[PDB]
Amino acid sequence: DENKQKALAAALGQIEKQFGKGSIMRLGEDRSMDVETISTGSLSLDIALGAGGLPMGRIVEIYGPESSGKTTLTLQVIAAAQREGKTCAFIDAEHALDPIYARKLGVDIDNLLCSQPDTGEQALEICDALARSGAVDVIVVDSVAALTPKAEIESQAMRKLAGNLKQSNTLLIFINQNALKFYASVRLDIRRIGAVKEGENVVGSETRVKVVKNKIAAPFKQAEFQILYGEGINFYGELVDLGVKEKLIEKAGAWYSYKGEKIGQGKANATAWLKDNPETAKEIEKKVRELLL
Amino acid sequence: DENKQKALAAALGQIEKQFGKGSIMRLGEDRSMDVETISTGSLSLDIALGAGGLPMGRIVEIYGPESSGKTTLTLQVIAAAQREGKTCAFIDAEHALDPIYARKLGVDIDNLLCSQPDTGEQALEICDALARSGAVDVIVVDSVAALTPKAEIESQAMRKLAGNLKQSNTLLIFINQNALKFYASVRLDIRRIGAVKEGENVVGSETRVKVVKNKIAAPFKQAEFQILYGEGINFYGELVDLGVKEKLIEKAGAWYSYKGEKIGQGKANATAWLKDNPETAKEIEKKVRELLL
Amino acid sequence: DENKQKALAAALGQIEKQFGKGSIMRLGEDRSMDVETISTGSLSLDIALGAGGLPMGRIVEIYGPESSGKTTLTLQVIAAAQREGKTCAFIDAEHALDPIYARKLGVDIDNLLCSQPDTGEQALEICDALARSGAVDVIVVDSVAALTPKAEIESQAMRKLAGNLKQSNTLLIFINQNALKFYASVRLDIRRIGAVKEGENVVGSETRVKVVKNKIAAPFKQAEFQILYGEGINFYGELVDLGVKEKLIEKAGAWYSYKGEKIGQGKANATAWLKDNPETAKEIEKKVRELLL
Amino acid sequence: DENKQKALAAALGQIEKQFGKGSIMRLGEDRSMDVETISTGSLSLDIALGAGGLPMGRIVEIYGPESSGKTTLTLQVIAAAQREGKTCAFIDAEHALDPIYARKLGVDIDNLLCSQPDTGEQALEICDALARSGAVDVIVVDSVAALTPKAEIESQAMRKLAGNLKQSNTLLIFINQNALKFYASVRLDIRRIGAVKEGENVVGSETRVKVVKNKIAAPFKQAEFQILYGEGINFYGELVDLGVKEKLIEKAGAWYSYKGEKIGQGKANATAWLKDNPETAKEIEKKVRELLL
Amino acid sequence: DENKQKALAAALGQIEKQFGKGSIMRLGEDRSMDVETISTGSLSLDIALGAGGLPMGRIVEIYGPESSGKTTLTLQVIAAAQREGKTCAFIDAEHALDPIYARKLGVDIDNLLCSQPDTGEQALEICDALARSGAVDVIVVDSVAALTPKAEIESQAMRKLAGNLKQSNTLLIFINQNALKFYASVRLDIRRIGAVKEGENVVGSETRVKVVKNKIAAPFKQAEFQILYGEGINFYGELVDLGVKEKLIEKAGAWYSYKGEKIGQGKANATAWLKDNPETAKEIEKKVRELLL
Amino acid sequence: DENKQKALAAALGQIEKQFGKGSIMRLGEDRSMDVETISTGSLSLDIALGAGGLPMGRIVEIYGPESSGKTTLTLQVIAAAQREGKTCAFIDAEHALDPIYARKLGVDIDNLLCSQPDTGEQALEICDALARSGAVDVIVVDSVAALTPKAEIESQAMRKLAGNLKQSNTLLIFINQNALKFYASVRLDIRRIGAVKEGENVVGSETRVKVVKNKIAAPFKQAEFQILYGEGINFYGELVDLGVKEKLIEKAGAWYSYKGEKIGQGKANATAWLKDNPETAKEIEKKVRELLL
Numbered sequence A, B, C, D, E, F: 001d002e003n004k005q006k007a008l009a010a011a012l013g014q015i016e017k018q019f020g021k022g023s024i025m026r027l028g029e030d031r032s033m034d035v036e037t038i039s040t041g042s043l044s045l046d047i048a049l050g051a052g053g054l055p056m057g058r059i060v061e062i063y064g065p066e067s068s069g070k071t072t073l074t075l076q077v078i079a080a081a082q083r084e085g086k087t088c089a090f091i092d093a094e095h096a097l098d099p100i101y102a103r104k105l106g107v108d109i110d111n112l113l114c115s116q117p118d119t120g121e122q123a124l125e126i127c128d129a130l131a132r133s134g135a136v137d138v139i140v141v142d143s144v145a146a147l148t149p150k151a152e153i154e155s156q157a158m159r160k161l162a163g164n165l166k167q168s169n170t171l172l173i174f175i176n177q178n179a180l181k182f183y184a185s186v187r188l189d190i191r192r193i194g195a196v197k198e199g200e201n202v203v204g205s206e207t208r209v210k211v212v213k214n215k216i217a218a219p220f221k222q223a224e225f226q227i228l229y230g231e232g233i234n235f236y237g238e239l240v241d242l243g244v245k246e247k248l249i250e251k252a253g254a255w256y257s258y259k260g261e262k263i264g265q266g267k268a269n270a271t272a273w274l275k276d277n278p279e280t281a282k283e284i285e286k287k288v289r290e291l292l293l
């Protein structure tokens, strides 16, 4: 019993000492590695990640079918980073960025560095150079599948990239539509699981993200949220549901209320209220994070 | 005659003395090695295994095509072990565990240890460390085919692992989609042999498991059962068929009855009755096991 | 002339005296060594072997591509031996025996001894121990190619094995997919040379076995027969063709007849008739053997 | 001049007296030792050998890559010998003789003596015993490379063998895929130098044999012929070419004619004509031999 | 000074009187012993030999790796000798002479004497008998390494051979792949130092011969030339280079010219011109020899 | 004390008077016999020899494994002698001299006398005749081990040779790969102790020479230097190290400087500078010699 508990603790400790704190974990442990993170723009996903956002200095992979929300997520990560004065770069092989939508999500387009590489090797070399500069905080590559080998147009790189990103504390996200599978500290499976309709017209998509790999906190948690056309992740909608779940917001059938006052009849109205009262929303969000992180 | 019977008995005895009781057996012998086991969650498979479940302290291999039920089986083994207060670990290289489905199968996710190794060598070293701790009862590796060599990403280990697992009495299961082939005490070939439909819609799969290698009891026995989507192995369905086979449950055409009373018209209803009357089901299961083990 | 005939007879006699009766032979001689044999389940192969089956106390090798019929042949040898009350053992390194198919071929699975060795050395030692017991009549090793050396997993043996098998009169068959090449008294090359179709669907395979080495009777004879899925060697089909060849069964174009009566139109129907009239079939088989052996 | 011619003649005569007529020769001399021979089945090779076939009482080596035609040649030698009522033996270590193909080549399989020795020493002892009998005319050993030493399975012999073969006038051919190199009177290098196609399908092989050692006539001559699948050496094709070369058969562009009459348009048709008119073919063959031997 | 010059001249003279003119030499002396020679077929090698070819009545050794050009050289020596009406003999232990290639090199195959000895002792005795005849001008032994001692198959000879060859003025060349090392008057080290390609395909080999021992003229000179497949030594190519070196042929960058006229652009074309204009080539060759010999 | 010092001085003096100045010495004495010498081409070895080079009129032995640098050393001795107008002879039994390499080392090949003796006795007699001429300054015999006795091919000499060499003041070096051991005044043990690489490719060998016997100065000193392929002993490299050792050249970490100016960064560059500025190099060399000799 106690003897076995001590033997297990020691064994797990030796494993962590040899391979790192995130090398083995109990799926239910409420502990996370002390790591600097950048918000994904989704409250439920920041919670599912355990650390409250994506880890700096690491490689992250986000994959899923076209239109599942990969680009939207990375643009919101960039916006979050830029708000904190961080320098971001976008390595593009898709040729599909919409600056109007990006600005809507909060991205400072004017200060976003961008490269549209001729070959996959050039793209990786540019990433490594930005990584080695110690002056770039976030790099987004969209997408992996578009990176065509030079030889074709006419593993070793990943190892060096990972090392350089770690040394400079640079977060790098690969959007994908074994090297990456193994070098990534976080891998996200994102998919559209339904449509959001304001009556009879489709205005967005119901989205689900599974954290299939997580080396900074317990893996396999999931997040669900809506992505509204031209607006991005419906953060306040997530806050309504999580506020209720943590018993910070009461739901009397269809009426939602906070601290004894109604904020809206129906999730849509409750969401709008939080959005129009950001100072209070920030307090609820802060409370939710303290409880679930 | 008698002289030859004694010569054969002595020869087989010498073989067993030199290489172990399971080194040679008569395929029809109703004897099994005294070994501690953990249920697979399938009554027919526990029977096919001869010992009533998978043997602790040994290496087991379960292989078959994608979606044949390998993960489902290992999760039900984990659930069975945890119910008995055993400590389990999941070494993942697939990045595909669904905790919602796992909890449905009975797994205590919160207490499940999990590791997502960077390389095949790291995965094996972690297994060995858990094995040497003497504090881990069940280790599941999913999957063998995903374990990529470090050198690639940028036999000797099996021998030590097997020895350590034996010393600590730790069961280790490798999911695969010559080292393993020879070090494993039990090897299971699992495959989907049909679809289960509740009318016009597919709700599960007809499954067949062949015990192709068994060093704890006679090999080559087979098990057949259904795996229902979101529910796992249809144990009560197996109990209906085995109860009838052992003449514990009578089948009057389409009506099934127990001790003179009808439990259901059609296998589906009979199955539901056993499921809703677990105390009686446990008695029938106990009877079946005593007769076939 | 006569002087040369006597000189040749004496020389051949001296060779046989020094190395054994089967050390030299005329390929056309209708003489075979007096040796106890076990049927292969194929009438044409028993004939091609010259002695009417495989020789007890000797080593036999059967090799050919996967699915050529090696296992089927050895299972039918086991069934034939068991029918005569002989004790058989199956040394398995393939982990692929199907007891349902085996029982269909006539094998008494319950009484079949089985070993699934960890290493090639262990397998050979088990064979030798069974050989030295004087209580095992037939040993089948499947397969040679799967016997991995212990050193790898982490000639001298053949000599002793051959001697022990001879002393106990134990037949041992090695299934293979220079030691064996030279120690074997019979070596069979088996291959699939076509498909058998009952209309538009494949129901079996056309098979050809060449006796490439034979130390008990003249080598190089061949046998041709069908192996039907789930049924094994089509013995009665061979009997139809051989009965006709030896003029015991008449064939009037498409109609086959025996002793003035039609047994079937087309080989398939004639085969079915013999199968349903075993007492007569046994007489024809006996006649064929007396004529060709 | 004349003095030097006489000195050379005397010196060569002394050499021959001391070591044998074939100890030294002028490569262009049209003289051959009076020796009994057996045809190889190839007209060009019988010519290249100088004596018209292989010499009895001597050792011959035929070597070349697999499928070059070694076995085919030896089987045709056996057929030629048997046609003359000679007794032949086949010492086999290859376990690959096809009696159907052999009969096609003219071999009297029923009367062919055969031995499949356990060791290289046993094979040589059997050869020597057959050699000493004075009752065996031709011995073929296939192959040298397969003769494994007893010690391994668990020069002095060649000297005695050669002496015994000489005394009994027995021809012995070793098929190989320094002892032999030096004891052999004839050594043949055979190789496939192309494919023979009847349109778009391969039906045979273009073959070339070099007489690299010849102690009965001038060495280094070459022979070229085709070996057709299932038929053996295309003798009549050689006869067409040699008949033309010796101006016995005229070739008017594509039309071949004999004694003023066309026998075929194209080598294939001319060959067929000779084959269908053997009595005339034999006369042409006889003429060619008288001119080139 | 002068006194020392006279003392040295006398000492060297006494040495030569006691051991022979070639017993000591100045490496740069442009003097050679008056000896009859036979061309090697290589202009640069005849020059490197100092005497203009190999010396008659002496023993010569030519050694080097397989395919370096040893046989080619000896065949060209034989061709040169035969052109002058000399009688040549080939003592073969290699069994590899190609008469087609030999005729291409100029060898009169029909008149070439050949022996294929059973033992090394027999080969040497045959050489000695040919040597003592006084009727053989050139003897080539290929090869030394193949001469196996009789005792094995089941110095003193060299001394007698050398004496007999000297008395009859017979040149003997040993091809090798201390007796010979010391009895030989000339020893040649030949090796392939590159490939000759007519574009992208290999058509020959770049060859280098070092005169490591020379008792008829200064040793250690070297020769470089090409050996073209099926053609032998590229003599005209050597003539182009030597003609230029001796300023008999002018080279204006890539254009070669003789007596004011262009003979070709590039060495290949210049070579072809000399080959097609042999009467002029012979004059240039004669000039080169007079200057370098 | 003083009495003992005088007794020792007298005793050593009597020994020297009776057997020669070099019959006994203090290993540390900085005195050497007044003897004419010829440089070895190695500055460190000339220093280790004590006299500044090899002594004329004496016998020297240089031995070591193949490729240790024996021939290179003797060729550089010959070059040094010839530069001073001395007459040199090369007695060869190796048949391996490369005149291209020799000229590179400074040897005047054209004026080098050379003999390639048939027997060991002939070689020694030629050496003695050259020795007695009083007109040869340096004789090199390569090698001792190759000198085969006449009797074999089919001490007393050393005594006379030594006497004659002494009388004529002729230096004779025996290259070896008790007579010599005792008659030699200097014996050198040379060996390769490493490889010299210009990056990743081997360009030379690190060499060590031990003066194991020295009758002209204190024995047992050692020399270390590099031998570069195609260039010989790296003299300037030795000068850099010795210049530094004697504080004539300063080394500031990696920078070498002379008289206040940098000559190169790294030994390689410093070496190159001395090589390109021979007039200064000669002054440094002269200084080093005055200090260490």
Ligand SMILES: Nc1ncnc2c1ncn2[C@@H]1O[C@H](COP(=O)(O)OP(=O)(O)O)[C@@H](O)[C@H]1O
Pocket (backbone or CB within 6 Å): A064, A065, A066, A067, A068, A069, A070, A071, A072, A073, A098, A101, A203, A204, A205, A227, A228, A229, A230, A231, A232
């Ligand atoms: N340019 C855009 N303008 C308005 N909405 C957009 C735009 N791009 C994406 N969206 C919204 O985001 C959802 C997911 O798109 P996106 O993040 O581009 O998917 P992915 O990169 O996975 O293909 C869309 O269904 C849409 O509602």
Ligand SMILES: Nc1ncnc2c1ncn2[C@@H]1O[C@H](COP(=O)(O)OP(=O)(O)O)[C@@H](O)[C@H]1O
Pocket (backbone or CB within 6 Å): B064, B065, B066, B067, B068, B069, B070, B071, B072, B073, B098, B101, B203, B204, B205, B227, B228, B229, B230, B231, B232
């Ligand atoms: N996450 C899941 N949710 C619901 N059913 C599942 C889930 N995973 C597996 N199953 C059920 O189990 C069956 C076999 O799946 P699984 O055990 O994952 O196969 P394998 O691991 O061999 O690929 C599926 O066909 C399905 O019915």
Ligand SMILES: Nc1ncnc2c1ncn2[C@@H]1O[C@H](COP(=O)(O)OP(=O)(O)O)[C@@H](O)[C@H]1O
Pocket (backbone or CB within 6 Å): C064, C065, C066, C067, C068, C069, C070, C071, C072, C073, C098, C101, C203, C204, C205, C227, C228, C229, C230, C231, C232
């Ligand atoms: N389990 C089985 N069930 C039904 N038929 C089988 C089975 N195993 C073999 N057969 C039949 O035998 C044929 C040859 O198979 P087998 O004897 O196993 O080949 P091998 O051992 O040479 O690989 C198959 O093509 C099939 O018709």
Ligand SMILES: Nc1ncnc2c1ncn2[C@@H]1O[C@H](COP(=O)(O)OP(=O)(O)O)[C@@H](O)[C@H]1O
Pocket (backbone or CB within 6 Å): D064, D065, D066, D067, D068, D069, D070, D071, D072, D073, D098, D101, D203, D204, D205, D227, D228, D229, D230, D231, D232
């Ligand atoms: N059993 C056979 N049936 C038909 N043709 C054969 C057979 N064996 C050999 N041949 C023919 O002879 C050619 C050479 O075969 P073979 O004499 O066996 O070669 P080797 O003995 O040198 O390996 C083949 O390419 C084929 O055309």
Ligand SMILES: Nc1ncnc2c1ncn2[C@@H]1O[C@H](COP(=O)(O)OP(=O)(O)O)[C@@H](O)[C@H]1O
Pocket (backbone or CB within 6 Å): E064, E065, E066, E067, E068, E069, E070, E071, E072, E073, E098, E101, E203, E204, E205, E227, E228, E229, E230, E231, E232
């Ligand atoms: N039979 C041949 N036919 C065509 N070229 C040949 C032949 N034999 C030799 N050669 C040419 O001569 C070169 C050297 O061969 P050879 O003189 O036989 O070498 P060695 O006797 O030293 O082994 C070959 O690389 C080839 O270009």
Ligand SMILES: Nc1ncnc2c1ncn2[C@@H]1O[C@H](COP(=O)(O)OP(=O)(O)O)[C@@H](O)[C@H]1O
Pocket (backbone or CB within 6 Å): F064, F065, F066, F067, F068, F069, F070, F071, F072, F073, F098, F101, F203, F204, F205, F227, F228, F229, F230, F231, F232
């Ligand atoms: N012919 C040559 N060409 C270029 N370098 C040579 C030559 N001969 C010797 N060397 C150089 O001298 C080193 C020693 O060779 P050498 O003096 O011949 O050794 P030894 O005579 O002791 O066998 C070689 O490792 C090589 O670097």
Ligand SMILES: [Mg+2]
Pocket (backbone or CB within 6 Å): A017, A018, A019, A020
């Ligand atoms: Mg670490």
Ligand SMILES: [Mg+2]
Pocket (backbone or CB within 6 Å): A016, A020, A021, A022, A023, A024, A025
């Ligand atoms: Mg941890």
Ligand SMILES: [Mg+2]
Pocket (backbone or CB within 6 Å): A070, A071, A072
């Ligand atoms: Mg996108």
Ligand SMILES: [Mg+2]
Pocket (backbone or CB within 6 Å): A118
């Ligand atoms: Mg561009």
Ligand SMILES: [Mg+2]
Pocket (backbone or CB within 6 Å): A182, A183, A184, A185, A215, B118
């Ligand atoms: Mg990681």
Ligand SMILES: [Mg+2]
Pocket (backbone or CB within 6 Å): B017, B018, B019, B020
């Ligand atoms: Mg044991």
Ligand SMILES: [Mg+2]
Pocket (backbone or CB within 6 Å): B016, B020, B021, B022, B023, B024, B025
């Ligand atoms: Mg047992």
Ligand SMILES: [Mg+2]
Pocket (backbone or CB within 6 Å): B070, B071, B072
């Ligand atoms: Mg799975």
Ligand SMILES: [Mg+2]
Pocket (backbone or CB within 6 Å): B182, B183, B184, B185, B215, C118
């Ligand atoms: Mg085991």
Ligand SMILES: [Mg+2]
Pocket (backbone or CB within 6 Å): C017, C018, C019, C020
């Ligand atoms: Mg016997």
